[PDB]
Design a protein around this ligand. Structure first.
Ligand SMILES: *[C@@H]1O[C@H](CO)[C@@H](O[C@H]2O[C@H](CO)[C@@H](O)[C@H](O)[C@H]2O)[C@H](O)[C@H]1F
Ligand SMILES: *[C@@H]1O[C@H](CO)[C@@H](O[C@H]2O[C@H](CO)[C@@H](O)[C@H](O)[C@H]2O)[C@H](O)[C@H]1F
Lengths: 649, 649
């Protein structure tokens, strides 16, 4: 056998790890399948995509087009359906009809071999008709055959009878394909909508207590859910909900010594009260948790638990499974680190003494929470545990429960971030919070919305308990407004950590990205009712952003994204599309000064001609404009962070 | 099993067609094997390349280094040896010693846990020693272990005993590798030197005749060989040597009707006198050819024959194998085309009726010429025959005779060009003749010397019977000189078509790349002796260029190539290296005006510091200069096309 087929079809994309890992999609998501297709000689080729479902049933006829002249790169859009493992194949073929037409169009006017040329056409169309399954379609082609063969008519009219729009349509639907040649199948993993699309809210249940019981329970913390659902969130992300160690417990503002009242850090998991399969006694019981999950469910909220594979020194594993830790010559275990950050309250896990035991126990723990309605896990710092460990774990869990979603909380180098997504992580944290200028946003989002989108789904948290960017520190509320608009409109998954709404932006010190009085080390009661009454929250903006997302399919996908040029460095503009839904966003990235600019839209990229005018509505205001080629905007911090417009149709 | 190993080693390169075709090299050629290598956590990794020969024997220890900070891309140079199919593997591992050293160097001076740190070192070095096969090497490591454990010495000196150059050398040669992880093997095809390196000369034997017999024979044309060898060429490329059809024979200057004297085009192969396995009667016999091949051999010249899989209408195949042609409804066979070029004197071959018969006959014909000492074929327009046909043919021929070299004469789109090389073509024609500005040469050669060098070996013909570039037409002799320097120094394979030496540059008409009175359609006798006497040939320059190439290993390879900036658009500068041989070239691409410039050398890329001065000799003149950071050149067309300097040691 030869590697190359009769009609070359090469380098089909997307491809992940040379075919050894699947490319990704979710139900209802469209993406481009592409290939290098060409043939020997000068005759024309055609190509098409055969997308097969998990039962092997092929999708509809999906012809490809050359993506740019002279490149031999061909593409077509496919749309994933039900969940499971799909496959895709590209078929390439000689297109004798396009070839014959091109030649006939020159030769008939120039009078060269006209009887021969026209009889050659007749024979192609006759072969075409043979394969057409409709009687009416077949009859149409055979009529053009007879007109092509009618030697009593002028050559120009015998030919014209074979170039009618009615024939065009039969051939476009059932074309004559020579020497059909197939690529080898490539795997596609299709997963549920929520893997790609959702709004996430993170908060600490323990902070939502009462005057008589400051440490919240699952029962008190459930009272906070209606407001989360009202802001249009879909996922609630909870930091670890397990007992918390006492040895080397950290105090307020990340101090080394806890006082007797100090609650400690939820990530310092485990005590004699229990480990990763237990509930912190001050949060209540497994039944209180079930209640919380149930109440979340009634409001359209799914729970994501933090899974942090690490231990306080009081975690049962320390004595029950010493081999799951790296011990130094004196028998002690070095606390975990992530330089320059030190984690004196925890031990990292070692994986090379008992990998089988760790995997078995990890999936046991996850299956336990899954039995209690948790179908999403936020995996803390997966880049400090082996890549293959996660590949094995995720494959074990998804093999019985493919709906489970894992989110990689890994802020690290690009190779590891990409690899984690490729080996199974449904979602990934990103460099979003460190992309704030227009150049940075434009470059980074072009990367995420391009080839990386075949294996990585990004979750744009505008802030996290560990990240209060200098942009929010110096920018105040107007910067909070900008970052929410950006996050919500540039990724189909975004989220915030409680307090973002209130523009909490006091750092631990200058040049730090830590919050002062960080919630990680203390109860942080917040007077939500007061903030709402006093209007010192951007909950309404957040609420509006999520409503717009729910009403505009373009914002529930990632790959279709285009940046339009403006004449001010502080003003960025982009559009996103999905069927007939087009959303156009203009943001002022200066949180401190009013900016005016001309936004010059790439009109063909919106499906419009250069001269056209198009009505839009700013969904932030209800205000309507008529925009085209070149549009004046004026964006005032405080009053207007951005325009978020839908194209009216 | 998991796709990813314990220590990630990903995307090993070179790779061709995702591993389904081999990457290429020749005996003695060095190239970079690279991979993405990293681990979980913050400890250091190492990596190395295991190159295995056709018998499976691994090459030497070949450690890799990270190629640029923060990228996790690692590389090392390997060198191919004997011919055949090799394999290469990248091994990645935890490097605990580098990790421990880095930490020990901070902790011992700062007094933190010193007994614990040093004992951890001792245990590593003990594990190191276990795997060392030399008694003397082992004894060295065990000494540093004992010095590390000696609690009566200061901490600084217990540590210093483990950082000696003598320990460094044992560990550099036999390091402690944790969790060794291997990539899957990738195939390497290693071929003979000539596939990559050689100077080629093309000429038409028939043009080298006598006053009494103007049509040359193999016996008269042999007289021309000593001069070809004297110019330092290694390969003689002959246009087709077979009988030439009479029906539709073309006349002079590509006219449609031959007169009775007209000789026709050698590519119009076949008559009643014979086909592709015959000799044109006016060239002599198979014995005369053997004589020519023998005489070429004695002079260090190998013969490359043109193989053009096409027929005159008088070729025997037309009646013996009608099914090897596509016939139209009236029984005629459309002449071959290559738009806008028409080939009225030939028929193209059709491959879908009897692919087996065509492959069987093609290898038969090639084996016939191979029996007569032809081990190189220049394959005419392979892009008009199926890609898989060549893949099969080349695999069949190289399976018995791996030394045979095929050269793809395909000026076409990039995809097909690359594919032809990937499926087996040892050498490729290129876009060289259409790259004449500095930007064009720089861009194109960066492409050829980079990733494409793992599957394509370029043959830089400065001209061909079909290509007289406008640059040569308008530039005159100075342009001929520039293009020879460029071709000879930028590719390890280059060539010229006879007449190039004489600066024949009269086009058929303005805006054509055809020669007037093209040798393809007529005998073209040339007064070589006169041109040599009158100094109106650049044969001496050519002769010098090939001597320089034979004396400078840097110019006998392709991948090591760097462009150095100059401050004039018309002056280009580059260097090439191979062991301690460094060649530095500066060319004035303006053939009409004198150009002066400052050449600012990237000194680290020469293995030198910025401040260093280095002696060079212009091998064109014998003249010696001292060059550094910044060097003044003055290049005068006619006198000086270029400097071609060697770095003096
Ligand atoms: C992911 O986990 C890290 C380390 O586990 C968390 O860091 C916090 O928790 C540790 C352990 O209790 C503290 O020592 C550290 O000071 C905290 O910031 C991150 O918050 C999680 F995202
Ligand atoms: C490769 O082959 C082509 C076409 O075979 C040659 O074109 C010449 O020969 C044909 C056939 O005799 C003529 O019709 C044409 O006018 C010629 O230029 C090229 O020279 C070869 F490189």
């Amino acid at each position: 056998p030869t590697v190359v087929g009769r009609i070359p079809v090469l380098d089909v994309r997307p491809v992940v790890q040379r075919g050894r890992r699947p490319a990704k999609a979710v139900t209802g998501e469209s993406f481009e399948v592409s290939a290098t297709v060409f043939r020997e000689g000068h005759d024309a080729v055609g190509a098409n995509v055969v997308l097969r479902d998990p039962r092997g049933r092929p999708g509809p006829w999906t012809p490809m087009r050359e993506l740019a002249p002279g490149t031999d790169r061909w593409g077509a859009t496919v749309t994933a359906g039900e969940t499971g493992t799909w496959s895709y194949t590209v078929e390439a073929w000689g297109d004798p009809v396009t070839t014959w037409r091109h030649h006939a169009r020159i030769k008939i006017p120039a009078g060269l071999d006209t009887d021969l040329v026209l009889e050659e056409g007749a024979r192609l169309y006759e072969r075409a008709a043979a394969d057409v399954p409709g009687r009416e379609d077949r009859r149409e082609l055979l009529a053009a055959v007879d007109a092509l063969r009618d030697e009593s008519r002028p050559a120009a009219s015998r030919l014209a009878a074979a170039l009618t729009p009615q024939v065009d349509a039969v051939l476009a639907r059932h074309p004559l394909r020579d020497l059909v040649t197939s690529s080898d199948p490539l795997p596609l993993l299709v997963e549920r909508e929520r893997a790609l699309y959702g709004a996430w809210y993170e908060f600490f249940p323990r902070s939502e207590g009462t005057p008589h019981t400051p440490h919240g329970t699952f029962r008190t913390a459930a009272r906070r859910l209606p407001a989360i659902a009202a802001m249009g969130f879909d996922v609630v992300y909870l930091p670890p909900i397990h007992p918390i160690g006492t040895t080397h417990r950290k105090g307020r503002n990340n101090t080394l010594s806890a006082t007797g009242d100090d609650v400690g850090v939820p990530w310092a998991i485990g005590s004699p009260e229990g480990g990763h399969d237990s509930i912190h006694p001050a949060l209540g019981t497994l039944d209180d948790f079930d209640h919380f999950v149930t109440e979340a469910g009634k409001l359209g909220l799914e729970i994501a638990l933090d899974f942090a594979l690490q231990c306080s020194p009081d975690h049962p594993w320390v004595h029950k499974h010493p081999e799951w830790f790296h011990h130094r010559p004196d028998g002690t275990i070095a606390h975990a680190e992530n330089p320059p950050k030190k984690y004196q309250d925890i031990y990292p896990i070692a994986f090379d003494a008992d990998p089988d035991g760790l995997a078995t126990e990890t999936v046991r723990i996850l299956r336990h929470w899954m039995d209690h309605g948790v179908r999403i896990f936020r995996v803390d710092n997966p880049h400090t545990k082996p890549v293959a460990f996660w590949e094995r774990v995720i494959a074990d869990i998804n093999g019985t429960d493919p709906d489970v979603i894992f989110l990689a909380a890994a802020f690290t180098r690009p190779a590891m971030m990409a690899t984690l997504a490729q080996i199974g992580f449904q979602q990934s944290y990103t460099y979003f919070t460190w992309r704030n200028t227009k150049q940075e946003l434009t470059e980074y989002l072009t990367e995420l919305s391009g080839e990386a989108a075949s294996y990585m789904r990004p979750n744009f948290f505008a802030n996290t308990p560990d990240i209060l960017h200098a942009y929010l520190q110096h920018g105040g509320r107007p910067a909070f407004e900008v970052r929410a608009v950006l996050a919500a409109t540039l990724s189909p998954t975004w989220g915030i950590y409680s307090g973002y709404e209130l523009c909490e932006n006091t750092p631990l010190r200058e040049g730090s990205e830590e919050y002062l009085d960080s919630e990680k080390y203390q109860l942080k009661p917040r007077d939500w009712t007061r903030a709402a009454r006093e209007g010192t929250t951007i909950a309404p903006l957040v609420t509006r952003l999520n409503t717009i997302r729910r009403e505009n399919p373009a914002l529930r996908q990632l790959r279709d994204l285009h940046f339009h040029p403006t004449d001010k460095e502080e003003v960025i503009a982009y559009s996103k599309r999905q069927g007939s839904n087009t959303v156009l966003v203009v943001v002022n990235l200066d949180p401190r000064h009013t900016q005016e600019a001309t936004v010059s839209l790439d009109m063909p990229q919106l499906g419009l001609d250069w001269h056209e005018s198009v009505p839009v509505r700013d969904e932030l205001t209800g205000e309507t404009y008529h925009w085209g080629r070149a549009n004046y905007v004026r964006l005032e911090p405080g009053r207007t962070p951005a325009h978020v417009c839908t194209v009216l149709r």
